[PDB]
């Protein structure tokens, strides 16, 4: 016989999902929204994620151990030599916005699937006006995993150690090559015919 | 009728058990003036509606 799968009546939730994907595909999307449909390549994303994994904040299990150990040690004394100043990345739209406007961030990563999208729809133009490099990336889950959260809207680099400088400079050059602002701001999306492809 | 539910039968049962006079020793124990029970009924005159 023949395959019956393409003829199944799926539950309403699944149908809504798929129709929404189709509609976004074949409508005329304005260029400001369209830039979030064209992320950065995968190779550069992997390089950046490795470098950023080297600068992750505290771990959840380390946090749990600290909550007892350092908590009860701060009572003993010597409190200052208890919170090390290890360099870490920063997350959160409020903090990111604060340090982009003051020019303390060298690289900003923005997730491509933020809902609602007005939360970060303006960030690329602010970064461009402030002379700060930025890159759109693939998923909120990955950015969250970088900082041990479920998801996040964006992270940013504020400082790096001298050893890691050459790799950071290579990443910066590749990003500046792969991200163009005027072209992105002039290009429409969508408008794909069903029968055509 | 002869084909009744138990629920109707139980409500008619209570009506019959209650159709009684005031006992003689009660009348004199309580020093009663009115010696008749005016909540009695007679089948030929009443409509129980039960």
């Amino acid at each position: 016989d023949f395959d019956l799968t393409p003829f199944v009546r799926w539950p309403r939730q699944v149908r809504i999902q798929r129709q929404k994907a189709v509609l976004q595909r074949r409508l005329k999307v304005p260029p400001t929204v369209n830039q979030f449909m064209n992320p950065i390549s995968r190779n550069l994303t992997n390089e950046i994620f490795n470098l950023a994994r080297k600068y992750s904040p505290e771990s959840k299990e380390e946090h749990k151990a600290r909550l007892l150990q350092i908590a009860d040690a701060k009572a003993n004394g010597k409190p200052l030599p208890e919170k090390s100043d290890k360099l870490v990345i920063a997350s959160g739209i409020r903090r990111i916005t604060s340090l982009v406007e003051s020019k303390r961030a060298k690289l900003v990563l923005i997730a491509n699937d933020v809902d609602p999208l007005e939360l970060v729809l303006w960030l690329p133009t602010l970064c461009h006006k402030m002379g700060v490099p930025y890159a759109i990336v693939r998923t909120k889950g990955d950015l969250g995993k970088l900082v041990h959260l479920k998801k996040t809207t964006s992270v940013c680099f504020t400082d790096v150690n001298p050893e890691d400088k050459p790799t950071f400079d290579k990443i910066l050059a590749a990003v500046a090559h792969e991200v163009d602002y005027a072209k992105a701001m002039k290009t429409y999306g969508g408008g794909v015919r069903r029968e055509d492809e | 009728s002869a084909n009744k539910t138990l629920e109707r039968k139980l409500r008619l049962g209570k009506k019959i058990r209650m159709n009684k006079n005031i006992p003689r020793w009660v009348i004199l124990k309580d020093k009663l003036k009115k010696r008749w029970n005016y909540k009695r009924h007679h089948w030929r005159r009443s409509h129980l509606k039960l």
């Binding site: 395959d3 199944v8 009546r9 | 138990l6 049962g13 019959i16």
Partner: protein
Amino acid sequence: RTNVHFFRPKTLVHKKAPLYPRNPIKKGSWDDPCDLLRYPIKTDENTTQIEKNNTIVFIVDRRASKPEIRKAFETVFETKVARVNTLITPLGLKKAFIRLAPDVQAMDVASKMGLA
């Protein structure tokens, strides 16, 4: 896929496991054997029943059924029972006709309980 219909999947189902009991103390009801039986009925027709058919007439709680009347009679009066017929009277009581087993003399049990 041999069926064109989408069905809800199968998921694990658990059992009830309350944190505290809903009825901490076990309580009795109306169905105790001695309170289930009320009293025997005494009339000439009934003494004739005892003599002729090996049968005793008793008043019981309306909520009792034949099997439990049989069990209660067997336990409270140590004897054997053959069959039970029941009846609800016009005044609302339940009447039982209890016929004893052939190798049992109903008259001696009746006298022992004081009915005779």
